[model samples]
Target chain A: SHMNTVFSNIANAKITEKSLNAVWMDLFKSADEVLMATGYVSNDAVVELHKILELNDHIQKIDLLVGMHYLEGFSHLQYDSLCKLNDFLRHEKRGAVYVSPFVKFHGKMYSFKNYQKINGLIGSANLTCFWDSTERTYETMLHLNGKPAQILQADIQSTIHKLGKNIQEVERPSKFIEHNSHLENCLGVQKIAPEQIRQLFAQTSEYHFSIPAKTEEKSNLNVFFGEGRRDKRGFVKPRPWYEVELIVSKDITSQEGYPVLKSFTVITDDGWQFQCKTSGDYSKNFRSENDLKTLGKWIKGRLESHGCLQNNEKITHETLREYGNDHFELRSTDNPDVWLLSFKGKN
Target chain B: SHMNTVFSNIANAKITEKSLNAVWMDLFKSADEVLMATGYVSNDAVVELHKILELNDHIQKIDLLVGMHYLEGFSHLQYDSLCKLNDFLRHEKRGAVYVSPFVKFHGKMYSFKNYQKINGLIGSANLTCFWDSTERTYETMLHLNGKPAQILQADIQSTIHKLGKNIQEVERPSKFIEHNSHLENCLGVQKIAPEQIRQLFAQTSEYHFSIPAKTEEKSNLNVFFGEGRRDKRGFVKPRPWYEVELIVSKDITSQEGYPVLKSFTVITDDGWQFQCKTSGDYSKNFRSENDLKTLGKWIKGRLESHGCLQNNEKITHETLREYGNDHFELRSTDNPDVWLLSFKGKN
Candidate 1:
């Protein structure tokens, strides 16, 4: 039974069993017997004493003297448990437990704290019904008789004494805030600098503007000329000018109800001296018409100065001159942007 | 008049004129006649002609000579008109006509199957406008008498015959399709072979099935073993088995209804022996419960037969004895096409 329990403790360290009551039964009985007999026993109560005997048997059978020696000499199971008991007395709750016989279980070596602190053992066990029926049943007790056990028990008693003396007992009923919420409350009221707010605003402002494209047209003329055409010998032709629709309109009135002199016109220097009136409302108020007339006069003066405008220089003026008008309107302001310049010619 | 006509032609050409009428006038007129003819041209006609010339003169002038050498001999005016004519002919109608005193506009190029032809001269003299001007009107008519004039006319008629017969009658109601589309229709449809179809299907099927990872379970296991663990050490004494939560029944089943075994099961030999319910589910489905029992019994029998099962030998039959039931299920159903098995344990 002792060997089975030892093997069970080792193997069932990580599994939870629903039907096994023997585990709790054995542990409680051993603890009760040892505590009742001596008031204390070092690290080994009756349950732990059983574990030690089982461990010794295991090492002897396996011929592992080095491990057995370490288990016997350096083990601190009862001391660890007593420390936990002391923590419970002082804090009114269990302290963390570090216990493992094979190695370190939690934070320390070999303790009842590992068993009691966690709800129960988990994982597979070799002490099944078959092992129970066939294996030898050995009776074991906690080795409270040993000097190491005595020293551990004394240390546990001293810890319990310190806990009992130093603990503050409270009786008042009060509402308590959780630690995390208290931290949050403190953080909520904290002041922030003006520069920090400005910095945040600046960071958000960075996303406001988008980068502009270098050129506005979707298809570039360069790409069309270089990559689109493959045949170098083939003649590249310009699209017919006749296909392009031209609109010319001039504005005639100003804001003050005055007649505007500006006249919009379309003119070409293609030696026929082509000029046409876009609108009929030519007056000094129209700045664009005046600008166009000035431009036409400049061109005429240049041509005359160059002697290019020889005898019978043909200039086609769209607007005809009427006899009653003292000064003929050479341009118009129907569309302020477009100008029409007129000169005398017949088809 | 000649200079004015030439100027009109130059202006219209530089601006890329599209009207056939404007192009005809530019090519047919003499230079001196053009200057005198400009005085008679109306503003309405000039405006109408400007509409015919659609492109910018600056752009046309730059491209006419620099890019395509379509316009070769005349001054800038004639050259510009020729360039515009070339553009209109090449792109707009895919046809053009050239009229010059020195150069013959004849059968150097093939005409389309159907073409409209024009004939007859409406005017009397070639230099009529040039000499009929009011200023410096000269007696330059070489043939004053009707006899020499009629003889010159007859000679011009014979010259027309040498230039090739004028296209008099063209087939009407013309229709045309793009070259590439026409070729495709002429070629007709192509048929595919059965073997080629099969090959295509197989290639596509192979591409679809050639996924990066074929098996889901293998991928899951790989992730668990390589990334799931904190330390990757499978066994620690207290926490020997990793606890994984299964929330639904479907979590256990994969392809072929096989349970997914944990990565820990593959790490140690004795691992499966302890956690029979967890690991055995995968093994049983892969083989069977009866097979496992048979295997256990076979092992035991072999040991006993070899005299290895002494009085100290402890044998447990907790899992196999409880689970084993069906005999037929023990047989492996793995197909030879998909699976292979080798028994090398004896070696």
Candidate 2:
């Protein structure tokens, strides 16, 4: 059986049956996934959304799309908020947030899906104005259940499909010194101040590398790729899928802050912490310690995420450009065992 | 009268007779305008350089170009610091900063110009490593005076000229709510927290506008442009070079928190505070208080700085894309007299 109800944040509105705050909690409590489209979204909305997500473990996925698409684009603060939400969802392997560069859809719609039923809400309030406010502002939403709710769900998905080509994924904020600054700030993690960042740069030693080695010997010897060989029947042997290593120059073979030992931990830009080492000629070849493919896998993963390379695709100079730079720069930090890896674009 | 002396940061080196730190300050004191080309630049280096500039008011213009142009591009921290320096110089109406995407220049050269003489320093040390550090990093430079310095100055100018088309200007950070956030932070002005920012948004009312008048009567009535008509000679009369006005809709006529009085102070996004007012039919036209052209001048100045529209060019939709958006959104803040203006691009 389908049911209908109305909610509002309008003060003393006679037609409204409930407040948005009450209705939101009810819908979220029983929902497994939530899909939201609004004319506008704000940093406060994002913070509240995150708080709700934390309270419900069953809410595994959240897909949000923002409208109010002005020709000027999103403000940096709003952009940062959306990015933090996107990164949080992705890091948890949940869902995503999308934006349309082509379509300027200005409607508020929400679909909460569960095994039992789908709950829908269509409204005049944007995510930013959805909350209960005492301010002299008016907002209203109509809630639906059963078939009506399912129809709204389908409509939301269909609208997204129609704008597929027009939509583009937003990337995480890219800062030099503190790679995960915004993400950390969103998660309430301790921030690394700008002063601290400069200090780290001052104490660091950086080594640069050109990706997809041009030399055959360097490619074969270094862990950047698997060992070059053929099978006994003269057939080409299958190599590891994600082999990665950095060929260190002899000039910095035993330089200060560099890995002097056989193994050390490499902390990648994307927050991967794994054991890596220097191997082969003059211990100048740097790679993952346990699995030769680990380092390569990490690099490939980053490239793919940045929309540069596809799965199982060969790394090339052009693809590296997609990931930012055609090369990688690894820097030594205060922690002797941990070296930070960064990808950059030439300018 | 050409002379050269070697400077180094190397401890106990027999070759270098002077240190870079000592030599740098000496050159800065005697110079009016400094031209610097370096392989790398860092925040600490920027801080030290800024200190030197602050100490000497005669050093009015500082033009710096950084190398180490990797594909991954400049770090966020490095970029921010450079932008601060750039904004500082621009606000003072002095020189500018530039970066070359076409050439990956890796050299360190500094030319300090003055009416008396031009001091030059050519070296291996990047701005990042130009300090007196006990760290095991070796750096050397050759200080030139008289003829040699003059030649080096010419070379620096020639190199910049060669990279003209290849170089692009960097922009100040564009945060939505706090338009001058980064510039203020750089100036050590108090920061408005994200929480406070959210509160402002929650309590605000926004008005949107389409730039450039399309209707003949509206053009004549509003201040967006000067009055349209013919002179006594039957030729088009010359209007104010800069004329701007926002036509407020009748729907918002006499709305709460809007300008009720004949005049109020409007604070612009670019940190401009000036008196403004409403005029025309239904008191719907908004423009500058004293000079009608003042508001338009501010808008034009911003458009010019963004490298979008040229001076005195007619504002068009296509041109707005260059400046961020085709329209402007004005939001009322807690301060009744102040309304923040922003330009955004559609996504």
Candidate 3:
């Protein structure tokens, strides 16, 4: 199989752009001479040549230059059969290159670039079985040797660099950091304060409930449950479930203001979830405690009724007070706003 | 009936505000004397009073007040009611004010207002049901005490003048022509250039077809039909009808640079229509003669297949062409955009 592949590659040398055509022709002629001594011009040789033509048609229609380069390598048949076509093209091509995948047939190689100039050229078609089976096929070919062809060639090189291996070779983009080591010597670093971080964590901990019940009536309750069940059993169900989460934080160290209240309710059942966060200081001008309590109660009612709250638990002052100790731990830190609360159990 | 109506109105007089109690009582006494000569109460009087309450509620709740002057009328009612009720308390020692429509109720009147004030201090629900129901309802009221109200009031007064005796009395807190006058001006101005007028008409005309279609294949054709249809025939074979009417000026005068072009199409039982009016300059953009021929042929095919045009007579190119010509007419006049076309033909 390898010898026959090499013999075909030698025959293609005559059509190559360089003088190596003569060298390949001479090698093929010498191989034929040796094959004649063993009476090798059998039916198998005819079948192989026909298969090579079919493979050539497929390779010539490749979209990328790297694909063309791989096809060129296949025409040469110098590399081992196990070599990946794209990797081989990258290794051999200089300046810039791109490629698509290759197909192997009967220990021979084929690519999707042989039918046309794959890079920056017009007029190409896929090689289907009909193309080979049809006897009355009309082919139109345009061969260019002037400035237009040269211009197209240059564009091909540029595109290879723009869209090829450079992307993988380039460094990654920049990213932001919470704290900078270089800023330690500065007068005041703008790092997120521990309290702010704590508040953010608490705020983010609570999930969002987007598909709330449109009507408060019990009839709407069935609709909500149906939607929830559909979401749970749907093919695209999102993982991890929790209905409602609330967080409260205070910056106690500076005595700058009162505790900030934040709450979030997440509905994971109905293919819909959103997180809402509201923060206000515990000052006179800020929202009153009664308003917060009302909001908490409203959310609790919604979550409990929607079956969003784990264990079908209702949100109430008593329930909150009881769960305050077991489910969460409050810790005092240097930054007053950094209140810690942690939850354990099913996500 | 009149006497009983007057008596009921007087008996329902009440005073809640100490400041206006005196004036309110005097007004009721005067009204009572005015109707003293009338005969016994009738059922119509009660109905009239009920109608008045219903109208008042409708105006207060549904209508939107744009100008400040109209809003002031609302304020006037509030103030007047307060004063009358207050006067009733001081003199007649009545704490309830009788409220009824001019067309409803007999001698027995219902107490509508007692302590309510019509100022900005009052809520919407209170003002809406001021002389009617005591149940909770959504109230929408505009208090026009500022400059905006003054301008709107003047405009409404002007409309009343134009209406002449057709309008009994200019209702306060009513939507005046000025609210929608911008559209009227654009449509009414005789001086508008024909081209601009055509563009405006075209823009608005297309808006009628902005609704989405039910099926993908017929979606594009849906633009020719009206948004809604009414079924007029019996259940045995219901026939749906959609009407479009355009009223244009009948006057004609010569003017330079005003060109007019009118076009319309008649669809067979299964065809679609396209119609438009354009100034001479824009008329050039109309569909080509070839396209018209193609459209005519398509309509002919539909007629041949469906046997009836819109469930009526058979359709033909000559008939459709005649219908198109008669659908729109361009008079030799100064206003080219004044051309009117009716797209009410069956399809």
Candidate 4:
């Protein structure tokens, strides 16, 4: 009888249930407004929520109150993901995502409100505790109704007003880790040792290619210069003045880990990220996704910083040697969508 | 007769034309689409354009191609301005802003396109050459018509395709100078010495205030902490957890050069900028314009970087003194809407 009493509140099943995915899906569909407070949230959770909302046409306003513990702050990926989520939702005027400055509240509660009553689920399951029951870990969420459900909802609302700061948007994604270290007193969050959290966002393979000089046009095909031609107006069309490209070899392109997409985001060491694409014959040409000159701008800027280049000066083989290396490397990260570009040999 | 031949192309007046403001105003009002190419553009120019577009209901799809010469790169103010303008216009789908990476092409051409024909103005006046005849400098422009106007129009359009990269938006305002230095082979622009180009955007006045200890609440008024109170819902209302402010004294408020506005943009030494407001009694309390905790975030982050602050530690007087100073200074710049803030004593 005692065991039965405990199992009675378990909402996902008649004692055997573990996956909360279906439970959350139902809660989102039924509720007019839902408020969730969790100690930690993974990027996958928010992205899944975005997909769920897209499939369900009904407007179910959600206010996600995300908290950080003193023991574990937020991974850079998590922070950036939440920020991007908030940016998208806020612009759509759907809902808001809030963060708590002081992380005393560590409760995992999801409260659903209709016009008349409130019902909720609270237990060991964090917003990110389990993707589904398919993972190795197990999580339990007990149902709350009547007075107890009302109490939990009221407390969360009050706690948000007291402790949470609604993150409006992300100014710079690169600053997330540093920003957290400065703003929060949690060192463990960022410096959480080698094998544990670090493995989650570890590096992948790296590829290097030498930048060919303009003088090597006959052999190298002069990838840096676009063809100069005339326009429809019978005027001499101006080619991209700072046009640049990286001639990827067949060996690198055939690699399984190389970015398979036509265009993807490339993150720089200096904290700037830009979209890049692979095109031309055999996907040999690597250039900026937008303006043709941006790739040139990026590479030239790095050269100037290396003190081997000057304004209005064309990059040459001699200039490359002066910079200590003419080779640039495209390094892959744990994240498939993101690759890092390094022109400076020192890094 | 030689002078008459030169003056014959002059459109603004019969004999003399000084102020192009009225001419520009008329041009914007009449043209359905206006394309302008200039060597240099000032922030004031874009702001004025925004105002002009506001007054004119006709959506004059304007495309502005701005160029940078090797002699003058851009003041941080100018880069931010052009970026912001591009962001606003692109979002509205009204027009776009373009930038030239290399600056061999220097022309001030304003070509107006109607369904029937193309007309233009070309000469010494840049988009930002002058505010009006009231200023000391004088500039001349010649009205282009007939085959000559069409020829100028075709050339400018071709030049854009050749050298211009349409500036989509700004990612980080602080990176403008460094970005330019990296990307361009120009040094004279950024290294333009003081007393010459530097005088245009310079510092104004400086003010300092000490961060008080939490123990001295009554004497210092606990500017860092907001009053704890309850809300109408009978819940203990949460005060801003990271609420922070710099209490401006009466001496600073009474001064002439202080930021007199209720709200303005505050530029930090670290490259991040935020909107700030002077509120409370006698406008003594200075806080972030939006979120209450951001100011605290900014200060605490700096303290952490200074190595005097640790995670979860309270900002006591000792913490600040260990960092070399308990004071934070707010410095005013020549730009009225902008001010500089620094927490590091070394800076």
Candidate 5:
């Protein structure tokens, strides 16, 4: 009953099908105050958030309340983006940015308070690539939008009631000194490079990762997000693909310096859910500035030329981070290592 | 059990989910001899088939034949196209070109015999404009394909036995007589062109025409094609297009010359399986030939500009002929006196 209400509450929400970025743009174009919460947000997600916060209809509370606390250390990329958003808001005399570590970057939600209509997203997608993937990453989010001001008052109240306390209670400083003295740890260290990772999968097949959403009911509430129809650009032989599942051990702490070379332990769809684990300290092994750069270019060439890319959808650095988050120990094609990132909402 | 086997036979078939013509070309390109049968084959379908037929692997029986016998006078477009196919086979030393009235022209079937892998399609689509649509027409078709000469031989035999004699027993000449005696009949009366028909739908929404195929058990088979996968240049709103059933009373006797401009007494989709008829001699009074010409130009622009037009897809005069078949009656769009042309398979 409770889950149904949570899902049903979305009946008043305006739905978006393509992507959450579209919803983000819609909010920035119209909303007065926007509350964003998710595990993470990088350039791919926050590049324009600052611009929107700068201008637009948000003459009211340019609310800087955001984040799902980085319990697991979020990446340098994420930290950097948050700083931009945080700095922009403070400079514009909006509100201070808050990053919480008490939260997990799981289900995504964003409530936009506009003078005319209040809108929000309460599903599984986010501005982050690990969450709102370039590959057909199966995620969920209920876009509650376009409800008139009359209903906006009611919806905003519910959103505020649900999100306000958590917003304040866990609002952690975007940058709390964590091992500041250990900054030199990244130096004097052998940094992992994209070339080494390429060597591992060189002869191995490059399986473009894919994910299908859930179908079963959760807590008496239907949790479906897709139908059975499919299409494609007919290739000689269908490209082999992989899917992601819950992380066993990303070994994010393994290669502490560069978030770029994190080995994404993954599985395949011959019945797949790719996993990531790094036998070495860092599973994905590269995250330093140059390492990430090389990795981005390599992945761009590898993936964009393949069939996984959708119309105008390219692989971003955030995408690289998501894929490399886990350091997987893959001996051969016989094994599938993955971190499931699926969600059965509300219920 | 019977239906199960009937449907299950397509187990090895290369399944295509949307428009059928692609399957046609794929098979024609590789098969030695191809057997194609449908309610009718117009320039639309035959247009591409000829190119494939001109080249490719066919050397053996070239066997099989094609068409869904047209008892009620197939149009000039169909007639002309048939003549080309007929002539091509003759040129290539094949005495095969079957057009059977016994065929219902409903469920379509094709068997492409490639020495290596004999495969083809068996579905409810068309060689007709209303049937073999390019833009994901919701038609039903199963791509019966696989590699293995052993199985192909057996399948070929069965297909030939079932379709061969019938192909001959009622191989209606693409040209019938009686009307041949009077070329002057169409003189005094002006003719309709493709342009006029285009004007009617210029701004009208192009419906993503869809058709579903029957499944093995039907119940367990998901009768789904796609999700919110909207493709196509959006028409302001979809124009309510109807599928035609039987010509209730095609004023066939009224206009002795051609079926174009012939009024169709009809029925429609809303509650589909549209049938055409003409209360008067010719129903669609094409304002004028020039009007028809201009309309054709406009529609060509509209459909092509919109997402509906494909690389080779076009809105030809014949498309207008079939659409305007049976001389649908009445005044205009200001009025609803109209009928759409839809083909039914062998009797």
Candidate 6:
């Protein structure tokens, strides 16, 4: 009456780097099924556990959900090991293997299912051996899906339950799908180096898909600055400082209620802008300073030629002063070369 | 000025086994990251990619999620190739790899991050070359974390945006975590020895895997299956068998001493033993190991004669061997109180 203690007790345990496959030998012989969500495993470890099953004339069927995904970072060497390991699992029909469809399958779980219950362990460790180590840090299959790393042990019970039912739900290695690649590697029950994968991408147009990528869009807002003239005064006969148009700012800022907008009029919008400009461009830097009276006279003459600022809404200097909010500054909109007389509320 | 159509999108493109490395030339010259979630790969693949990364003004950090997973199986030939490929990857700085835990992963994806955009894909094909192929089976790996398989194209905009910042979000292979096994394999590396698997199990106790296995429980209970004669069957103990030890069944149900177990007198509690018996000892059949046991001498003993397997759980015994499930005659019981009274059922 050995009782059901051996097969029914569900013990809670951790399978660290050192304890991973090392712990398999203990209870695997009696169990009928072994399941895992672990993402790593090595040959020595698998061999060790297999012998343990035979040690006491024990044997159990194994099924694992430890397939890594194609998240694109494997070294050529890693790929070979993976493919070879793949061959190993495929050859032994005793236990089946499973994996996530994409990205890194960052899960670590193991369940040795006996008659009614199981001896299981789940943690941040994969079935792969970390026999010796240098430096210290912990890494499980967290980067799966490239999402934030999550605690995988929590998903064990449920996953294993599902695993018990349709272990095949987890897809087989891509090599098994009857492709020329897998066939060549395991043809007639033998393995060989298949064709070079490079040629597949040879004709760029031959591919149905390519790497997911993107290029940045440059901000195309180049600008100028100027003041608006208002004719609120009955004295429409004359006006001073008519229409002031000047080039602008790198003026980046969220103003009173305006969205952040920069009038290139600012950097000189860098002298950098002026430097990139064509010599014939109509931009004169008032670097030598001081031109007012003459400048005013020219502006006035031009205003007159432009037929007197007639907006009818007639913004006046007095009104500009009255409604401080009405004060004008050079503003940039969709166009890059001209500044609009935009009014912003004073702080 | 060249508009920023250069760095802001996660493009969707498949890197077919054939198209994989060949496609690297396109924008790779201007890329900073090359990430893939492809499954089929090899040393040649890595070496080729490596060469491409060094070809011309070629350069880019390659992080591949190409590591395969789980520990269910492996082949010697593949192992050698894997070790070699691993060595190649390890020797370089431009490429890296990662994989799932066990089983074959059936996912294909790649990401090339250049300036502000990322180029990537998610599908059924692997990074391995599928030289000649016919028909098509649409297999887009939308099963990331069991999440709806949104077209990886969907993850683009956002991914490229982040990629524009610091894009290592693509997971690295678990091997990246320094470990002696992986480091050595990748460092100078390699292997090859097909299994005689039978030879491995010969020694029984001398086995590497068997010896390593120990039926878990730390013997939490030195069990016995009797319901303490509550009414006190105390007529001065007329217990039947003398010394009650019996010849056993290589009771492969489950275990402890060896990876399975050996029962002493749990017959009253229904004891089971995993007995792989031979002539008078074990070493004769298995060369390199030692062990002891005799079957005929024990069968003549009466310890097994004391048991009455009654209480009737009605185990229909129809010889499982006919169905192949009985390759080895193992015993199982219900009450855990009688050993000889065990039975097997047929398919």
Instruction: Name the best candidate (by TM-score).
Output: 4
lDDT of 1 at B274: 14
Question: Which candidate leads the pack in lDDT?
Answer: 2
lDDT of 5 by residue, A289-332 (tens): 31122222222223323322222133333433444421222233
* lDDT of model 2, residue B125: 49
What residue runs in model 4 are displaced by over 4 Å at the alpha carbon? A1-241, A280-282, A310-317, A345-347, B1-131, B134-347
> Candidate 6, residues B10-112: lDDT per residue as tens digits?
1121322223222333434456765655444533234334333433333346555543321212222223334443444556655544443422333344455
Better of 2 and 6 by TM-score: 2
Q: Give the runs in model 6 whose Cα sits over 4 Å from its true position.
A: A1-347, B1-30, B42-47, B54-57, B67-82, B102-104, B130-347
Query: What i-RMS does every model get?
Result: 61.8, 32.2, 44.0, 34.8, 23.8, 16.8
| TM-scores for the candidates | 0.11, 0.27, 0.16, 0.30, 0.24, 0.20
Candidate 4, B140-208: lDDT as tens digits: 344445555565566566656665677763233222332221100111101222343234335555543
Write the number of the candidate with greater DockQ, choosing between 1 and 2. Answer: 2
lDDT of candidate 4 at residue A178, scale 0 to 100: 24
Q: After superposition, how far is residue A290 of candidate 2 from its true place, in Å?
A: 61
Q: Which candidate do you rate higher for TM-score, 2 or 4?
A: 4
lDDT of 4 by residue, A1-347 (tens): 00000111111223323235556545545677888877666544554455445444454577787755322345554665577767766877777888764333344567788766776665434574222322211233444455656765775676566656677632332223222111011111111223432443355555433334333542232332334443343222223323455677776677766664478776554444567888877687787774454566556556655656542245677777787666666777656676766665443
Higher-DockQ candidate among 1 and 6?
Answer: 6
Poorest stretch of ten by lDDT in candidate 4 chain A: A1-10
Cα lDDT, model 3, residue B246? 22
User: Each candidate's fnat, in order?
Assistant: 0.00, 0.00, 0.00, 0.00, 0.00, 0.00
Q: Tell me the tens digit of each residue's lDDT in model 1 across A1-347.
A: 01111111111121212122344333322331111111112221222222332322211110000111111122233333334333432353322221112211110001122212211111111111111111111111111123333332333332223212211222211221111111111111112245543433332111111111111121211111122221233322221111111121233233232223432333222211222322343332212222222322333323323333221122212111221111122332344433222222222
Candidate 3 wrong stretches, greater than 4 Å: A1-292, A302-305, A309-335, A338-347, B1-347
Minimum summed lDDT over a 10-residue window in model 6 chain B is located at B1-10
- What TM-score does chain A reach in every model? 0.16, 0.46, 0.18, 0.45, 0.39, 0.30
Cα lDDT tens digits, model 1, B285-319, are 22212112222222322333333322112332321
What's the best-to-worst order under lDDT?
2, 4, 5, 6, 3, 1
User: For residues A1-347, what per-residue lDDT tens digits would candidate 2 score against the true structure?
Assistant: 24333433232333335666557656755678888866566543564465345434677887887654322245444565566666678878677777754344444678899886888766444575233232222333456677767766765665455432222353432321111112221111122345544555566465533333323323532232444344343323233334545666766776555565467766555444567777778777777764444555455545544556542245665665555565556677666676666554332
lDDT of 2 by residue, B1-347 (tens): 23333433232333345666667756665668888766556543564455334434676777777644322255444555566666667777556666644344544668888886887765444574233332222333446677657766765675555442222353332321111112221111122345544555565465433333223323522232444344353323234334555676765656555565477665544454567788778787777665554565566545544555432246665566655565555667656676665553332
- Indicate the residue-level lDDT of A105 in model 3: 7
